Amino acid sequence: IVGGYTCGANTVPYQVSLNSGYHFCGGSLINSQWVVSAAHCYKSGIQVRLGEDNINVVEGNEQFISASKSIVHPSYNSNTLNNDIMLIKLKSAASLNSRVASISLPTSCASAGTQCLISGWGNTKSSGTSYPDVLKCLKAPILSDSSCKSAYPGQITSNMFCAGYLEGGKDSCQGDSGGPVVCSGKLQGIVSWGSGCAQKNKPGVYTKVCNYVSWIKQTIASN
């Protein structure tokens, strides 16, 4: 997260860290045994880390649970990043409390102008690299479908929306991938891709979760 703020320990209780020896992606807890992330975060040997603030220090509210199964969306296209979503089932159910909680799935798609909260442990600098150890937050609006398509000609599908600032300065970045975009208490997006970070006229692009509610629900009900 570039140009964000320090969230505060456990103020984003649905945020998860995916770990394969090191943090490599974010995700969101949607019930006691399932995590949603980006399909481009796929790999084998994932451990899901819940209740994290400082990802380098054991602070007392963590739960570490291995993944038992990962399901990449059936139509994921790694070249275009269309359908950039994936579900991960946990080996055992998480213990839900005030600091580890699920986030509701949306019943309707959010409109442009809606203010959202984006969070992650990604790079905080638009040139160079500095990776934070504690969770960073960003308030950003959803941008109009027309300004999004004008920023990225030929690359935006109906499964994507843009959020952020056309002036630049504030954005998600490398290592925020797979993390949540939450608007009015509902999971509306997944950190997917961008052109660099926080560059002028290049806002971040996010997977449009409201398009996938039926697939998520049916997948969970049968796995």
The DSSP result for 27-42, as a single string, is EEEEETTEEEE-GGG-
| Ligand-binding site membership of 52 (annotated) | yes
- Contact segment (CB under 5 A) with Ca ion among 57-65, 73-81, 140-148, 202-210 equals 57-65
Cα(50)–Cα(60) distance, integer angstroms: 11
| Ligand-binding site membership of 104 (annotated) | no
C-alpha angle 217-102-177 in degrees, rounded to nearest 5: 85
| Ligand-binding site membership of 167 (annotated) | no
Amino acid type, 12:
V
| Ligand-binding site membership of 177 (annotated) | yes
**Catalytic annotation, pick one of 37, 119, 177, 192:** 177
- Residue closer to Ca ion, measured from CB, 94 or 116: 94
Residues 16-55 that bind Ca ion (CB under 5 A): 52, 54
**Catalytic annotation, pick one of 23, 37, 40, 176:** 40
- Residue closer to Ca ion, measured from CB, 12 or 72: 12
Strand 115-120 relative to strand 180-183, pairing: antiparallel
The DSSP result for 145-208, as a single string, is HHHHHHHSTTT--TTEEEES-TT-S-B--TT-TT-EEEETTEEEEEEEE-SSSS-TT--EEEEE
Cα(68)–Cα(156) distance, integer angstroms: 33
Q: How many residues form the binding site for Ca ion (CB under 5 A)? A: 3
Residues 58-117 that bind Ca ion (CB under 5 A): 59
CA 123 → CA 13, 74, 134, 160, 183, distances in Å?
21, 30, 12, 22, 23
| Ligand-binding site membership of 47 (annotated) | no
Q: For residue 156, with 0-12 CB atoms within 10 Å meaning exposed, 13-18 middle and 19 or more buried, which class applies?
A: middle
| Ligand-binding site membership of 82 (annotated) | no
The CB-of-182 to Ca ion minimum distance in angstroms stands at: 21
**Catalytic annotation, pick one of 23, 84, 102, 119:** 84
- Residue closer to Ca ion, measured from CB, 19 or 83: 19
Closest Cα to residue 189, out of 160, 222, 147, 218?
A: 160
Catalytic residue check, 177: yes
- Residue closer to Ca ion, measured from CB, 52 or 176: 52
- Residue closer to Ca ion, measured from CB, 39 or 48: 48
The binding site for Ca(2+) consists of 52, 54, 57, 62
- Catalytic center residues: 40, 84, 177
- Please state the residue numbers annotated as binding site for substrate: 171-172, 174-175, 177
Residues at the annotated binding site?
52, 54, 57, 62, 171-172, 174-175, 177
Residues lying near Ca ion in the complex (CB under 5 A): 52, 54, 59
